[PDB]
Amino acid sequence: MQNQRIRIRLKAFDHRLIDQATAEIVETAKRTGAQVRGPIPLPTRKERFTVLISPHVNKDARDQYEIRTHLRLVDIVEPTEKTVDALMRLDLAAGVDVQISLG
Amino acid sequence: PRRRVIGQRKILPDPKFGSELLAKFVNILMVDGKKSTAESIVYSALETLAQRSGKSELEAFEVALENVRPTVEVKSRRVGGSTYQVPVEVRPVRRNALAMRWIVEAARKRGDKSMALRLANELSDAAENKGTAVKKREDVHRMAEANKAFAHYRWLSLRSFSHQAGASSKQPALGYLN
Amino acid sequence: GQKVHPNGIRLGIVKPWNSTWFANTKEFADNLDSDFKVRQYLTKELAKASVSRIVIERPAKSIRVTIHTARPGIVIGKKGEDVEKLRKVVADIAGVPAQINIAEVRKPELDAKLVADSITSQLERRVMFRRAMKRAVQNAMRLGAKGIKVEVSGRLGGAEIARTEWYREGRVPLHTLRADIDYNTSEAHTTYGVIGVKVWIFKGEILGGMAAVEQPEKPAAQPKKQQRKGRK
Amino acid sequence: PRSLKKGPFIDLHLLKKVEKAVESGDKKPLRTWSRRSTIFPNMIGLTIAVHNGRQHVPVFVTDEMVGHKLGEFAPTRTYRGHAADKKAKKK
Amino acid sequence: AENQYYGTGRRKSSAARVFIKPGNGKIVINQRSLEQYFGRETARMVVRQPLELVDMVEKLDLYITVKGGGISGQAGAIRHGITRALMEYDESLRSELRKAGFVTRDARQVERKKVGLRKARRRPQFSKR
Amino acid sequence: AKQSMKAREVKRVALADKYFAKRAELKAIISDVNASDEDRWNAVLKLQTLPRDSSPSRQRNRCRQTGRPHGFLRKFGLSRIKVREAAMRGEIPGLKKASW
RNA sequence: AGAACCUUACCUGGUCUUGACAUCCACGGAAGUUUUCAGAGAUGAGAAUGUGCCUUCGGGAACCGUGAGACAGGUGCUGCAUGGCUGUCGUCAGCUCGUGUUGUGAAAUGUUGGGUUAAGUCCCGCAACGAGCGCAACCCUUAUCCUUUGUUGCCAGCGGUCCGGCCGGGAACUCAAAGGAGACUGCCAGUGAUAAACUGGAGGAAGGUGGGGAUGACGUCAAGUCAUCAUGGCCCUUACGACCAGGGCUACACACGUGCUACAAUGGCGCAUACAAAGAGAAGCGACCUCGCGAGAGCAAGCGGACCUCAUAAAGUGCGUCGUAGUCCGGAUUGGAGUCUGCAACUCGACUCCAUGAAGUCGGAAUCGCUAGUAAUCGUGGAUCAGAAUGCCACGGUGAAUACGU
């Protein structure tokens, strides 16, 4: 199997927003470089919460809230520096935070 | 009550022999959800039975399931100042299961040094109609011949019946005006 | 007094959230509490305008306020000193420098908080309420929408008993997941204490004001998409 | 079992009380809030009045009680016996 | 006609991948022997159970890949993957196997642990008075 | 609700930095197994009494908005009731009612 | 939702009153940080680092100590004085708006009937006409399955090879996140007043709004919160405020509600043996490491989590072994030692582990959820999270009797 050269990771709470933001980065990479791949789905995280539904008592009725978190990876097999230059330059989003740092 | 007709599950042949009549037996042999043990108890019992008579491993199991089978049941549905009992002839799915329950109900008290032996002894016995659940049969049919007396809030039901194209006589059965 | 809150299950599809930003778990509380402080202290300044929603958004190295209004000019004030003062304090609260835009104004007469300020004014001002509930309803159905519910409480006329009253007319769905649909519960004070109106208004069962993204994954991005399938 | 883990405790509060107390050998009972504090050689022969939350209770400090805390000699909770239910209070 | 016909072997949200071909009667499980995958397990007579049922021990060569589930269960899916894969020796093959249940996926689907309840349906117990 | 537990918390965070910073690493150095016949000397561990309110064991924080104790949730900086008021109106990003 | 102090309301002990926290003034100090000593700690006194901001260059704010006011502060009282919010009935299967007509009117009618259902769903029909609410639906999710990606994913075949995608390489294959597809009593047959619909047929994973969730009428019950918070009436404001500490609900004569696990052999003992899902790890966890019976210790590559780790998932299987004797089940207690988070483990904290070893053999009165991925049962992770889960939330293992009949 392959070894990970570099990690670009996209983190969002809205599922349609991330699918669109990776597809546009992927477009920018084929237009501004030569060595791209189609976006890896990567498994989604979900945090579980429980709270009351009344101010006081009523044990039976309760409430459950969810918050979902979506992860896309792209995994461009080689970004040209000119690809990385366009990525960080055309950023403007709020539903997603794009990560270009490595670790 | 109940608006429309509602269905029943269907058991799909077990993973270690390929029988529906065995996959339903192992389902009542289950204690603490553990059918995958109840399988291990059936096949280890069945093989001990198989030394006792070699013509089939299922010999003494298959005839137990005919001989201790109740054919009749007694039902209960309170009326006012009275509880009563009202007999019904029982449907085959519960004829079969009562007998499966009773073979295993008797086995878990047999005290033998392995459960595969406990279940194998009570089957060799209930096959010949000598065992523990011949009595369980006997009682359940006695009640069904004895309780033919009773009807559901009877004194008014007996006119209500006679005009609903019922008989001039007390019907000893559930949920009818009698 | 029943039901899980009617707009709350709608928050994942065709209704926007009231705030949209992301912080990677450990800083999510620090960002949520600042997102509250900008809500609380900024609206204090625009007290004299009329406003339907407040929408706070955080890109890298920036905080963007969207505000939704009864008219476009109402927040700007004389010669932009006012809107700079708003941005001044959004920059002071937030760990970043600030942008503010006024949105496009669309159905401001049928919007959740602006229709309910119009109705709460009658009870606030201690008018007889002999005809009010009907004139509220007459004007919502005369300016638009497809159905309305109003429920008014806070001891109408000054009462020393619990005293509620209500009005529904047209179509008002409650267990619907699709389209935005506008609900507001007002809180307001008068001489005898706090009064409040619960207002559902229903504009349409299909609304395009938030809609799913233009493409699926499969047609989007690069023309030559197939892999080498090994061969480093 | 439970322990005092690994570090050194002399307690700040008994260090400063004890230093002035030792100089006379002994003086009138030392007004103590320190129920956290263990019993020590430096404290042998002092009379330590131990706040229980309601009032100070005198603990006489002596060699046989050094495996112990001040808060063990001084009580907290009340036990209703079952010869017959407790009719009366104890202070 | 294809190099190996393939079955998807669905039982209880676990998938038995099963590549069937003509050969000499052999079984391969996760690229190793039976003693390796199903070490001291009843699971070895499980996987033999669909091969006896249609009388094909000495005619299928097999390559088997399986993930998830409990071990007696992984085999129980392979018991469905072996009959899944078989469909085309004859036109009625799939009709008769579907009537016996050995193509048919376990149509029951998970129920989520529910809000306000101690399980999926388990409501609190109270005598409260 | 009450102001006194919230006041306690407000006064505590300045006493965490002031008392606690200099004692931060001090448990591993002076006490535990690294203090085998090194340090383990009484005179620098009588000085953790000043940090006694400032102690990691009272760094329980509770709600950040009000300082109000009990039933807290660190991820919002809120609690059951105060999470619910903001979820109801959509004031929290990505947070909605659950179905699957 | 994680009770030594904190938390904590309660109670007592020290100590001040603009006061924990904001603006404003008066006076010393910059705040921030480090430090000796008295004092329980609060607090106070002195010390050294720094001497910022503005400037009527006095002096002040900022923030801290002191002081006074305007004022801040109140789990302060009242839930027939309230607002905001939610619970009951009940998935009852009904309730209402607009309008006419019949009666003098309160009010009926529709909202009632026949047939049918999850349904005010649908065929028929009368003064009910027109229409909305609950339900029905869109909706998310799941299941195959259509579809694109092809990694930290996969691997019929091929290579190093323990046969692990770790890697040369390979796309038959799940598989992951996303567009979602399919199922409508629409087809065909039987039944049913044409009929909704129930059942049967057939392909498909699945025929009966496919499984699961979302999902809750007007609203009485004067149900409950002034303790999320809004808040009038309305009281203290040297306090129904505040710093600091200790003590408590975790008490003991007991009963009771709940959950757990057990009372066996379906198991447990020893040895050998197998595969999870989902999520957590940015303040944090963490392979190898050397020490340690373990817990843990102290070092640390590494990480961003489909790569590494929590985690050995357990129950279940193999073999040999056990007989009602509270044991070969069950293993609680307690002595004792090692370890941990913290000035500080005593009542009231955690963990490992050695030795001995009880109650309990399914339990009176009482007493509840369930229609099937349910119920039952087994383990896991997470939310919370100083230190502590039997609980809650979700997940996967293994997975039940029957629903005639009103």
UniProtKB/Swiss-Prot annotation, chain B:
Keyword annotations of the record: Ribonucleoprotein, Ribosomal protein, RNA-binding, rRNA-binding, tRNA-binding
Result for mutant: K35 to A/E: Defective in ribosome assembly
PROSITE patterns to which the protein is assigned, alphabetical: RIBOSOMAL_S7 (PS00052)
Any one biological process term the GO annotation gives: cytoplasmic translation
Main function: One of the primary rRNA binding proteins, it binds directly to 16S rRNA where it nucleates assembly of the head domain of the 30S subunit. Is located at the subunit interface close to the decoding center, where it has been shown to contact mRNA. Has been shown to contact tRNA in both the P and E sites; it probably blocks exit of the E site tRNA.
Subunit architecture: Part of the 30S ribosomal subunit. Contacts proteins S9 and S11. Cross-links to IF3 and the P and E site tRNAs.
Stated family: Belongs to the universal ribosomal protein uS7 family.
Note: The strain K12 sequence is shown. Has been predicted to contact the N-terminal domain of IF-3 based on footprint studies; exactly how IF-3 interacts with the 30S subunit is controversial.
Protein name as annotated: Small ribosomal subunit protein uS7
Organism taxonomic ancestry: Bacteria, Pseudomonadati, Pseudomonadota, Gammaproteobacteria, Enterobacterales
From Swiss-Prot, chain C:
GO BP, sorted A to Z: cytoplasmic translation; ribosomal small subunit assembly
Annotated InterPro entries: KH_dom, KH_dom-like_a/b, KH_dom_type_2, KH_sf_prok-type, Ribosomal_S3_C_sf, Ribosomal_uS3_bac-typ, Ribosomal_uS3_C, Ribosomal_uS3_CS
SMART domains reported in the protein's UniProt record: KH
Domain KH type-2: 38-106
RNA-binding is among the record's keywords: yes
HAMAP family given in the database record: Ribosomal_uS3_B
Family: Belongs to the universal ribosomal protein uS3 family.
Name of the molecule in the record: Small ribosomal subunit protein uS3
Gene giving rise to this polypeptide: rpsC
From Swiss-Prot, chain D:
InterPro entries attached to this UniProt entry: Ribosomal_uS19, Ribosomal_uS19_bac-type, Ribosomal_uS19_CS, Ribosomal_uS19_SF
Example GO biological process: cytoplasmic translation
Coiled-coil positions: none
Gene3D superfamilies on file: 30s Ribosomal Protein S19, Chain A
Keyword Transport: no
Highest taxon of source: Bacteria
Gene Ontology, cellular component aspect: cytoplasm; cytosol; cytosolic small ribosomal subunit
GO molecular function: rRNA binding; structural constituent of ribosome; tRNA binding
Keyword annotations from UniProtKB, A to Z: Ribonucleoprotein, Ribosomal protein, RNA-binding, rRNA-binding, tRNA-binding
Database matches in Pfam families: Ribosomal_S19 (PF00203)
HAMAP family: Ribosomal_uS19
Function of the molecule: In the E.coli 70S ribosome in the initiation state it has been modeled to contact the 23S rRNA of the 50S subunit forming part of bridge B1a; this bridge is broken in the model with bound EF-G. The 23S rRNA contact site in bridge B1a is modeled to differ in different ribosomal states, contacting alternately S13 or S19. In the 3.5 angstroms resolved ribosome structures the contacts between L5, S13 and S19 bridge B1b are different, confirming the dynamic nature of this interaction. Bridge B1a is not visible in the crystallized ribosomes due to 23S rRNA disorder.
Family listed: Belongs to the universal ribosomal protein uS19 family.
Subunit structure: Part of the 30S ribosomal subunit. Binds S13 and L5 and cross-links to the A site tRNA.
Name of the featured protein: Small ribosomal subunit protein uS19
Organism: Escherichia coli (strain K12)
UniProtKB/Swiss-Prot annotation, chain E:
GO molecular function: RNA binding; structural constituent of ribosome; tRNA binding
Keywords annotated in UniProt: Ribonucleoprotein, Ribosomal protein, RNA-binding, tRNA-binding
Transmembrane feature ranges: none
InterPro entries attached to this UniProt entry: Ribosomal_Su5_D2-typ_SF, Ribosomal_uS9, Ribosomal_uS9_bac/plastid, Ribosomal_uS9_CS, Ribsml_uS5_D2-typ_fold_subgr
GO BP annotations listed: cytoplasmic translation
GO cellular component, one term: cytosolic small ribosomal subunit
Signal peptide range in chain numbering: none
Keyword tRNA-binding tagged: yes
NCBIfam families in the cross-refs: PRK00132.1 (NF001099)
Biological function: The C-terminal tail plays a role in the affinity of the 30S P site for different tRNAs. Mutations that decrease this affinity are suppressed in the 70S ribosome.
Family the UniProt entry places it in: Belongs to the universal ribosomal protein uS9 family.
Record's subunit section: Part of the 30S ribosomal subunit. Contacts 16S rRNA. Cross-links to the P site tRNA and weakly to the A site tRNA.
Annotated protein name in UniProt: Small ribosomal subunit protein uS9
Classification of source organism: Bacteria, Pseudomonadati, Pseudomonadota, Gammaproteobacteria, Enterobacterales
Chain's gene name: rpsI
